[PDB]
Ligand binder design. Structure first.
Ligand code: CDL
Ligand code: CDL
Ligand code: 3PE
Ligand code: 3PE
Ligand code: 3PE
Ligand code: LMT
Ligand code: LMT
Ligand code: LMT
Ligand code: LMT
Ligand code: LMT
Ligand code: LMT
Ligand code: LMT
Ligand code: LMT
Lengths: 115, 345, 142, 120, 171, 105, 98, 172
């Protein structure tokens, strides 16, 4: 109950500041004020057009590496096992293959951003 | 691909079905099917053109969707019975979605529409893997739960596949599309008999595979993608005309070839179970396959189509193919009906 | 469900009697086949607009329902007039009448003629199956 | 159908109880035909490689013939065993259930009245 | 479809050991040494019988043993024991390591007054054997008789009679 | 499995966590351990077809233990009959069902 | 438990319906697959907790591991589709009709 | 508090409805983040802890990659929201109405079957080992390192092979 209570208060405080910030100040809306900023000149296109991602391969590698750490985060419970040798070999093998995967991608220039 | 990539990817292609066939747990069976999907995609798209990209994408979205439905059934059964295998007490709807999703993975009609398109978009040697090695894992699952399956859904899938495999293959001029429709028709036969006698499902799978493998090797010899391309065989590799003709007639199930055996035995077993009407319909529409195979035989070995001047330069060159696996499979796929009693029991 | 029972009511009484109820049952069955076929048609061969898709769904369903009505009516009237409840010929006449209807709706004597023979033979064989206890989807026995 | 039977070893090509069966003759007609197929495979392989069909690679031809016969002999032994097991189970089941398989006392044609259908 | 038999509320009346968790933990090591025989009898009943209704008599002896143990502390060592469990009760986890000074004063008291030796590390976690007049339950799961296995077919293998018998094949 | 490699080699890659009654960490029995143990043991050695009829008692009990359809319905009936009587003013819950119990121990 | 599992199965069915009823973006469909994965994860996790089946808790994690591999391949394919056509629209992926 | 888990599973259902309607993947990505959070709460509510926090953490990472991919390869001039198209908005409202209807009707016919609105909160936790120590979900997951090592072998192989797969798919 307590965790729910404090997070609601955190939400409540943030939303109150937003309401104050939008209803206290004097406003003056006109078109030139609300147009998008681009260093004093008009944009030549939408900001909604495609924006190329040069690190796209690192990005999807990160998806796999993020499930690798998910497999590592039970380790504090796993070190309590009687089967210490089995746990240790499994953890060593898991870390080593992930290193080999990173090493391969590194030597394939998979960490280099595209030009 | 460099050697390390080939070894890892081909090993994973091999591994997935082995996991599926050896697993007691349904989750590990699903894991095996997951390995197959993931590992085969880079091979499908290896050549990297718009058609191969289309083929790999269509294959991915179909297979991943079917994999989720299979997982739903496994999870629902785990909820119902607290176990990781389907039982006699598993809810029938759970089993019917497993059958639906596996049949979509296999490309059985009416979940077939993807398969002729994907086969058309990929290299011949990948079509070979798609239509042979990749069938084994989903079929292996079905064979395990054959007493639990609904005969009504199976026969409807089976007759639909035979009908659409037949009419589908009738309109094709592309070889890769003809093989895909041949796959669908033969899967219809494999499935029809699975709930009655799963050993005859395996007999049909084996005979289909040893017919399809050398047929793909024959296409691979000159990279014949169309009827008009294969019709130049008489000028490029005439020695293959005898075995292609017999393999095509064997695929069509004409006696006294080995390919008559699966249709013959499945009819016998279906009628031991009073499945007379379906067996009649299946056998009658399977003749339509023999029609488009015959038209193919007409354009390769029984007539000689016009050739071209550049083909003379080909006759100056020596070839190093086919390997001797072609001759072994070609002979055993056509001339082994005398040994029929050793193949069914 | 009760929907299944509504279709078992076709065989509750011998042919040639209760021809009104049997005509509703076969009209309903024909309509369902038209709805299924229409669904695959519009999904796989989409129309140029929604009003054409809906127009095509109605064309298929009513045509399929008409075929089922003519088959069910003609079969029962034929058995009533000929006083032969258990004759597969009554079903052949009904299946031919259904086949003629299909040709009349699609403006084709070849479909009428080809429809009559194929649908007559299929319907006659259905009656023989009902009499001789054939199973369409037998469960495994051996 | 037989896979779950009592005393079934997993992935055993030739169970030890199969050694009570008479082995196939080495000139069994099915084994002679296997060797003939191996010979055809060798000739077809020569044809496909544009070699003299009968003359080229007699060492390759001999290996084709011997492999087919060698494999066929052991496969034939396994197939003999599976058929023998099927009969062993069928007859054994018949003995445990004599009420489902009664001996039907048949009547002579002196008592049976078959209908006569004149041909004319 | 049978009636579940429940003991009456009167059968479930006992003298409660109604002291707090810090009091129990402070005395837990001496309690385990002093009331072991009664406590191990009750736990053997529970694991053998798998039914709390079959162990009510032994459960009541557990409560009486615990009350006789705490009355010995009350009559001889009340003040050393109170100083100890009150210090132990301060910690959010009731840790032993924050009150070693008060534990030693209590331990010395129950040693001189009552001769009670605190068990060593590892001793209370041992599996021990206990003697009981209670019979061993014969079918604690109330399981039915297992269905009889299929009759096995015996004899030596013979060849298939007339070979495979597959249509027209002779062998 | 389709290929019984694990049985042939006498290993266990996935045979030993197949059902509720299997080994659990720190010997924490799963729900319905005793019912699933009884159902598996009744069925052993007789095959699935016979087990469906002849172990029907064990399966129903295990099914009830795990899914608890009957337990939920029985409590729904008692609580529904109590609601009817209280509205009619014919039943008054005791003090211990109203939050004024004499807590044990 | 009863009502929670009904709602979770409905959540899977909606995600599958989303997968089966394409709009234009291939990426929107890839998100629907992740929705089915998410539903199945919770269903497996809640079942293991409700039955106190601690030996089955590895399985939900393995569901996410292979889903990550499936999602990574899906995104890798989507890069290829976008490179060919400049969008991820599925109507362009129609060359294999002939 | 007796409605707590039903409310959460009801929120989860709406999130998947929003995803199924497939607005711009920007809002699809947001829909999965909220559903992931709601899904974490449900796992927590049933006594979970590690599993709930894992799936939220994994999906937080997963949707960040999808955000990056969306801005490069799945964007249009006018990205669609749930309100932008009247047709999508109507099926959002109709879908929510059909949820209330489906739960209402199923409650009437069975009353204790799939929906048991009278008994909500009485059948969340079934059994709990009151005096236990080693019971948290992380212990169960950790069996991959000792008792279920095959599960970890296959999981590790798929991530390792995935690196080689995605490198092959993405090279030109
Ligand atoms: C915060 C409170 C909202 C304040 C917004 C505001 O400043 O006023 C704008 C608005 C006033 O009108 P307006 O400024 O002319 O509208 C122009 C906006 O740009 C137009 O607004 P927009 O471009 O931001 O698009 C609105 C859109 C986008 O808004 C959102 O959906 C994000 C929040 C969803 C949570 O919202 C909807 O489509 C309806 C949302 C319905 C709830 C979603 C249910 C399905 C998803 C289930 C998963 C839950 C996530 O109110
Ligand atoms: C109850 C449902 C509860 C809500 C559950 C929703 C489930 C998730 C929704 C996923 C739908 C989706 O993504 O599809 C996108 C799919 C493709 O969208 P798109 O590529 O962006 O453009 C085509 C749209 O028509 C948008 O382009 P448009 O504006 O040119 O569409 C023209 C037309 C579209 O006509 C429609 O309104 C289609 C819906 C017909 C009513 C269906 C009633 C529900 C049954 O709109 C109209 O003028 C008719 C309005 C009056 C309709 C009442 O859109 C649709 O076709 C309709 C989507 C909404 C239908 C959801 C109902 C699902 C039930 C299964 C129906 C199939 C059953 C077939 C076997 C029987
Ligand atoms: C194993 O996968 O066999 C499957 C199937 C037998 O079915 P089943 O009994 O259910 O499998 C369990 C144990 N085999 O096994 C089969 O279906 C048999 C597949 C046979 C494929 C025939 C191809 C022609 C090859 C002919 C040469 C083989 C040897 C011929 C006989 C030699 C004896 C002279
Ligand atoms: C029950 C009644 C089933 C009727 C079978 C569907 C026939 C519908 C049809 O007419 O074909 C649909 C589609 C194209 O048809 P269309 O182009 O619209 O019509 C000709 C235009 N000149 O033609 C097609 O592409 C083939 C239709 C898809 C396959 C239909 C699958 C039938 C159902 C099998 C279920 C098996 C369950 C297991
Ligand atoms: C195998 C057995 C084969 C050997 C048996 C042969 C016996 C046949 C004897 C009777 C045949 C009499 C046919 C007379 C000639 C008619 C003709 O040639 O035209 C056929 C006509 C062609 O169709 P069309 O005019 O082009 O219109 C477009 C249709 N899509 O119409 C058509 O082609 C389409 C007609 C479709 C309706 C027929 C029923 C099909 C559904 C089967 C139902 C069974 C259940
Ligand atoms: C290709 C990937 C390669 C990377 C993976 C390599 C993994 C190989 C690991 C080698 C190290 C194993 O190290 C091994 O540790 C275990 C405990 O963990 C030690 O084991 C020792 O302590 C344990 C307690 O833990 C005792 O029960 C055991 O009797 C004793 O041998 C072994 O003496 C040591 O050999
Ligand atoms: C295909 C099945 C049979 C083969 C089985 C698989 C084992 C193959 C063993 C030989 C593999 C060695 O293959 C070798 O891989 C390394 C990966 O580090 C590549 O090399 C890579 O790293 C080295 C670093 O100095 C550089 O060449 C470069 O950065 C990159 O290409 C080599 O270009 C390739 O030649
Ligand atoms: C149950 C009975 C079994 C019947 C067995 C069937 C036998 C095979 C029938 C298919 C015949 C193969 O097809 C036949 O191939 C041979 C080469 O081998 C061709 O042979 C001819 O043309 C080729 C070039 O095309 C020349 O190189 C060759 O010298 C010439 O004889 C025939 O023109 C063709 O018709
Ligand atoms: C236009 C000609 C068409 C030729 C095709 C064959 C036509 C014959 C089929 C229609 C005959 C009457 O319709 C047929 O009878 C009734 C309808 O109430 C149902 O009859 C059957 O129902 C179920 C099958 O689900 C059986 O278990 C039941 O024993 C039997 O009564 C069938 O579902 C329907 O097929
Ligand atoms: C017991 C016997 C009962 C007999 C009645 C049942 C049989 C029904 C036969 C239906 C015949 C098809 O119906 C017939 O189709 C032709 C096709 O040229 C169409 O005929 C009409 O339109 C077509 C083009 O649309 C023109 O080319 C033609 O000159 C004109 O007559 C009509 O639609 C109808 O005259
Ligand atoms: C051109 C298309 C037609 C192809 C013709 C196919 C071959 C000829 C079909 C003959 C029809 C078989 O006729 C049918 O046979 C079956 C199978 O024995 C038997 O029928 C019966 O079989 C068994 C009893 O043995 C019953 O359990 C079953 O329910 C019932 O159908 C009857 O004898 C007859 O109803
Ligand atoms: C997106 C958000 C969706 C919100 C969904 C709706 C949330 C509200 C849930 C309403 C469902 C029923 O919610 C509430 O259930 C409890 C059980 O816990 C019932 O419980 C109470 O009333 C019923 C009889 O009326 C009896 O069980 C008993 O007298 C008492 O426990 C409440 O009467 C009912 O109002
Ligand atoms: C072709 C690719 C595959 C080859 C690569 C994989 C090699 C295998 C490595 C994984 C080995 C797993 O090895 C397997 O471990 C489990 C525990 O996890 C052991 O399991 C053992 O302990 C468990 C603990 O609960 C008992 O319940 C079980 O009854 C017992 O067999 C198996 O006896 C052992 O066979």
């Amino acid at each position: 109950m307590n965790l729910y209570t404090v997070i609601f208060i955190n939400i409540l405080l943030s939303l109150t500041l937003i309401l104050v910030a939008f209803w206290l100040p004097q406003m003056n809306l006109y078109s030139e004020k609300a147009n998008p900023y681009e260093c004093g000149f008009d944009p030549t296109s939408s900001a909604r057009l495609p924006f190329s991602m040069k690190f796209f391969l690192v990005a999807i590698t990160f998806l796999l590496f993020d499930l690798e750490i998910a497999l590592l985060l039970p380790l504090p419970w796993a070190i309590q096992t009687i089967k210490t040798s089995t746990m240790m070999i499994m953890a060593f093998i898991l870390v080593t293959i992930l290193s080999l995967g990173l090493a391969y991608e590194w030597t394939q220039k998979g960490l280099e951003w595209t030009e | 691909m460099n050697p390390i990539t080939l070894a890892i990817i081909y090993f994973t292609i091999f591994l997935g079905p082995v996991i599926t066939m050896s697993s007691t747990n349904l989750m590990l069976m699903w894991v095996g099917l997951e390995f197959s999907l993931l590992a085969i995609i880079p091979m499908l798209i290896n050549k990297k053109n718009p058609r191969s990209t289309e083929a790999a994408t269509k294959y991915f979205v179909t297979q991943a969707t079917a994999s989720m439905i299979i997982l739903l059934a496994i999870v629902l059964n785990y909820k119902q019975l607290g176990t990781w295998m389907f039982q006699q007490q598993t809810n029938g709807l759970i089993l019917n979605m497993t059958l639906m999703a596996l049949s979509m993975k296999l490309g059985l009609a009416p979940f077939h529409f993807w398969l002729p398109e994907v086969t058309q978009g990929i290299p011949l040697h990948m079509g070979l893997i798609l239509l042979t090695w990749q069938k084994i894992a989903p079929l292996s699952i079905l064979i395990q739960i054959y007493p639990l399956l609904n005969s009504t859904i199976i026969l409807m899938l089976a007759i639909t596949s035979i009908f659409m495999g037949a009419w589908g293959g009738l309109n094709q001029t592309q070889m890769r599309k003809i093989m895909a429709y041949s796959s669908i028709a033969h899967m219809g036969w494999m499935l029809a008999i699975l709930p009655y006698n799963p050993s005859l499902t395996l007999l049909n799978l084996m005979i289909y595979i040893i017919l399809t493998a050398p047929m793909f090797m024959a296409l691979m010899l000159n990279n014949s993608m169309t009827i008009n391309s294969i019709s130049l065989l008489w000028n490029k590799t005439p020695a293959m005309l005898t075995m292609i003709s017999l393999m095509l007639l064997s695929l069509g199930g004409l006696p006294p070839l080995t390919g008559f055996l699966p249709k013959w035995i499945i009819i016998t077993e279906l009628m031991k179970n009073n499945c007379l009407i379906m067996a009649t319909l299946m056998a009658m529409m399977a003749l339509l396959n023999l029609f488009f195979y015959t038209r193919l035989i007409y354009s390769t070995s029984l007539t000689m189509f016009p050739t071209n001047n550049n083909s003379k330069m080909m006759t100056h060159q020596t070839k190093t193919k086919p390997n001797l696996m072609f001759s072994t499979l070609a002979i055993m796929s056509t001339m082994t009906l005398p040994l029929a009693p050793q193949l069914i029991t | 469900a009760m929907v299944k029972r509504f279709f078992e009511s076709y065989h509750e009484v011998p042919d040639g009697t209760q021809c009104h109820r049997k005509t509703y049952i076969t009209t309903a069955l024909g309509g369902i086949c038209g709805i299924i076929g229409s669904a695959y048609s519009v999904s796989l061969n989409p129309a140029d607009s929604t009003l054409e898709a809906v127009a095509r769904v109605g064309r298929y369903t009513f045509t399929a329902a008409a075929i089922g009505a003519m088959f069910g009516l003609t079969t029962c009237v034929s058995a009533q007039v000929r006083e032969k409840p258990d004759d597969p010929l009554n079903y052949f006449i009904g299946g031919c009448a259904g086949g003629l209807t299909l040709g009349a709706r699609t403006h084709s004597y070849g479909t009428a003629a080809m429809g009559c023979v194929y649908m007559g033979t299929a319907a006659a064989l259905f009656k023989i199956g009902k009499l001789e206890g054939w199973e369409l989807f037998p469960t495994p026995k051996v | 159908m037989m896979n779950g039977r009592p005393g079934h070893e997993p992935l055993k090509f030739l169970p030890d109880e199969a050694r009570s069966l008479p082995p196939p003759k080495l000139n069994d007609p099915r084994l002679v035909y296997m060797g003939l197929l191996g010979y055809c495979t060798g000739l077809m392989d020569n044809m496909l490689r544009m070699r003299p069909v009968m003359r080229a690679g007699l060492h390759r031809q001999l290996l084709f013939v011997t492999s087919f016969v060698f494999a066929g002999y052991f496969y034939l032994k396994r197939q003999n065993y599976l058929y023998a097991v099927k009969d062993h189970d069928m007859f054994g089941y018949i003995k445990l259930h004599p009420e489902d398989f009664p001996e039907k006392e048949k009547k002579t044609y002196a008592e049976i009245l078959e209908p006569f259908h004149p041909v004319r | 479809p049978g009636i579940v038999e429940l003991p009456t509320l009167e059968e479930l009346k006992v003298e409660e050991v109604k002291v707090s968790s810090a009091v129990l933990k402070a005395a837990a090591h001496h309690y385990g040494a002093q009331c072991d025989k009664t406590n191990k009898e009750f736990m053997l009943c529970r694991w053998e019988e798998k039914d709390p209704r079959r162990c009510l008599k032994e459960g009541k002896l557990v409560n009486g043993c615990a009350l006789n143990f705490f009355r010995q502390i009350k009559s001889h060592c009340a003040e050393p024991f109170t100083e100890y469990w009150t210090c132990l009760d301060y910690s959010n986890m009731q840790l032993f390591r924050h009150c070693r000074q008060q534990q030693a004063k209590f331990d010395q008291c129950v040693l001189d007054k009552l001769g009670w030796v605190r068990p060593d590390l590892g001793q209370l976690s041992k599996v021990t054997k206990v003697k009981t007049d209670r019979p061993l339950p014969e079918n604690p799961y109330h399981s039915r008789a297992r269905p009889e296995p299929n009759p096995v077919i015996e004899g030596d293998l013979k060849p298939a009679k007339h070979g495979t018998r597959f249509f027209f094949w002779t062998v | 499995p389709f290929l019984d490699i694990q049985k042939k080699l006498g290993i266990s890659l996935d045979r030993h966590f197949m059902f509720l009654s299997a080994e659990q960490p720190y010997k924490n029995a799963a729900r319905c351990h005793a019912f699933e143990k009884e159902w598996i043991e009744c069925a052993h050695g007789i095959g699935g077809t016979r087990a469906k009829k002849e172990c029907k008692i064990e399966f129903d009990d295990f099914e009830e233990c795990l899914l608890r359809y009957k337990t939920m319905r029985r409590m729904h009936d008692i609580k529904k009959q109590r609601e009817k009587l209280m509205k009619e003013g014919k039943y008054t819950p005791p003090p211990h069902h109203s939050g004024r119990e004499e807590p044990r121990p | 438990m009863p009502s929670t599992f009904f709602n979770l199965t409905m959540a899977f069915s909606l995600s599958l319906l989303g997968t089966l009823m394409f709009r234009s973006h291939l990426m929107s469909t890839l998100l629907c697959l992740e929705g089915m994965v998410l539903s199945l994860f919770i269903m497996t996790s809640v079942t293991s907790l409700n039955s106190n089946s601690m030996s089955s808790m590895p399985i939900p994690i393995t569901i996410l591991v292979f889903a990550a591999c499936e999602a990574a391949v899906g995104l890798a394919l989507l890069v290829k589709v976008s490179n060919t056509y400049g969008t991820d629209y599925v109507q362009n992926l129609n060359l294999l009709q002939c | 508090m007796n409605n707590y888990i039903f409310v959460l599973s009801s929120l989860f259902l709406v999130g998947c409805l929003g995803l199924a309607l497939k607005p711009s993947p920007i809002y699809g990505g947001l829909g999965l983040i909220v559903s992931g959070f709601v899904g974490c709460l449900m796992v927590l509510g049933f006594g979970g802890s590690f599993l709930g926090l894992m799936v939220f953490l994994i999906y937080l990472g997963g949707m960040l990659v999808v955000f990056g991919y969306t801005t490069a390869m799945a964007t249009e001039e006018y990205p669609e929201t749930w309100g932008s198209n009247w047709l999508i908005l109507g099926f959002l409202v109709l879908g929510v109405i059909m949820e209330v209807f489906l739960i209402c009707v199923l409650n009437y016919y069975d009353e204790v079957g799939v929906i048991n609105l009278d008994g909500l909160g009485d059948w969340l936790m079934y059994e709990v080992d009151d005096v236990g120590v080693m019971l948290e979900g992380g212990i169960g997951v950790a069996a991959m390192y000792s008792c279920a090592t095959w599960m970890m072998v296959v999981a590790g192989w798929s991530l390792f092979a995935g690196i080689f797969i995605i490198i092959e798919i993405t090279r030109d």
